[PDB]
Ligand binder design. Structure first.
Ligand SMILES: Nc1cc(Cl)ccc1NC(=O)Nc1cccc(S(=O)(=O)Nc2ccc(C(=O)O)cc2)c1
Ligand SMILES: C[S@@+](CC[C@H](N)C(=O)[O-])C[C@H]1O[C@@H](n2cnc3c(N)ncnc32)[C@H](O)[C@@H]1O
Length: 256
């Protein structure tokens, strides 16, 4: 019924070859060549551990979330968001939590600028964690699934989990499937209470309808979601557009 549901049905009809040509058509991406080569060699300075550092940097450099004080990073994985925040002037502590174990990335130890204010803790399912006081709440959880009802369930669970962590603080939260009417209802209620806006990051793949609820902005959630569904549906029409290439983020070295 929603434009997003039509997008997901069409995405599920693609062959692997078609899917591989669609997923990056017209997106933006950072060139990870140098970082991957450095990481393979065990280099611990300058490189971002994942594409996530540039993905969060995109929101921060637009002032959509402005990390400060004690940052919590839920679903930190290898730690791209955490290591990026560790170098920001207003940040004083970064605590990352992630599941780890089979099927999940482990935190990567690094020596990028501000490493000494970061603690990444694996073996932590955030759905069992009691909330902690923080000045910035980040969450990048939401596992894609071919089933949109599984994605709807996973999105609602994240939105219910994150709310007790929100106390008039800065935030950036992934919304895996933002187009279902039940999710829209939660998002509108959450925006009435905590403010912010839902934003599509250009570095996201066309194979996910993810959007991020960020704290600094206003706007109409329904309009923003439908614009993304129409964008993703239009990207099935034409031949692959190679992604727009950008430089990856240099996270430096040193303590603070
Ligand atoms: N065409 C289109 C298609 C889709 Cl499916 C979704 C969105 C758009 N359009 C844009 O995204 N337009 C836009 C224009 C100039 C700069 C940027 S920006 O993201 O670089 N910086 C911002 C953005 C918003 C605010 C705000 O509202 O406070 C603050 C800073 C975005
Ligand atoms: C891949 S990370 C996102 C990228 C990350 N922001 C970065 O920059 O590296 C998302 C993570 O959420 C983790 N995750 C999934 N379910 C989780 C849960 N219940 N509790 C904690 N972490 C979870 C996954 O293991 C995955 O590593």
């Amino acid at each position: 019924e929603t434009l997003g549901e039509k997008w997901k049905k069409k995405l599920n009809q693609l062959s692997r070859k078609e899917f591989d040509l669609y997923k990056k058509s017209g997106i933006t991406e950072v060139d990870r060549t140098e970082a991957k080569e450095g990481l393979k060699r065990g280099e611990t300075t300058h490189h971002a551990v994942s594409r996530g550092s540039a993905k969060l940097q995109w929101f921060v450099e637009r002032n959509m979330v402005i990390p400060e004080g004690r940052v919590i990073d839920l679903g930190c994985g290898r730690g791209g968001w955490s290591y990026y925040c560790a170098g920001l002037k207003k940040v004083t502590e970064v605590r990352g939590y992630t599941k780890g174990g089979p099927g999940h990335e482990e935190p990567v130890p690094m020596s990028t600028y501000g490493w000494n204010i970061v603690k990444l803790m694996s073996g932590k399912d955030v759905f069992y964690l009691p909330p902690e006081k923080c000045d910035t709440l980040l969450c990048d959880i939401g596992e894609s699934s071919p089933s949109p009802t599984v994605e709807e369930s996973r999105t609602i669970r994240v939105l219910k989990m994150v709310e007790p962590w929100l106390k008039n603080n800065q935030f950036c939260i992934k919304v895996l499937n933002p187009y279902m009417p039940t999710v829209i209802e939660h998002l509108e209620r959450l925006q009435r209470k905590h403010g912010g806006m839902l934003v599509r990051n250009p570095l996201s793949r066309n194979s996910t309808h993810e959007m991020y609820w960020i704290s600094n902005g206003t706007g109409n959630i329904v309009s923003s979601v439908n614009m993304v569904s129409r964008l993703l549906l239009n990207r099935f029409t034409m031949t692959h557009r190679r992604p727009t290439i950008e430089k990856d983020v240099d996270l430096g070295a040193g303590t603070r």
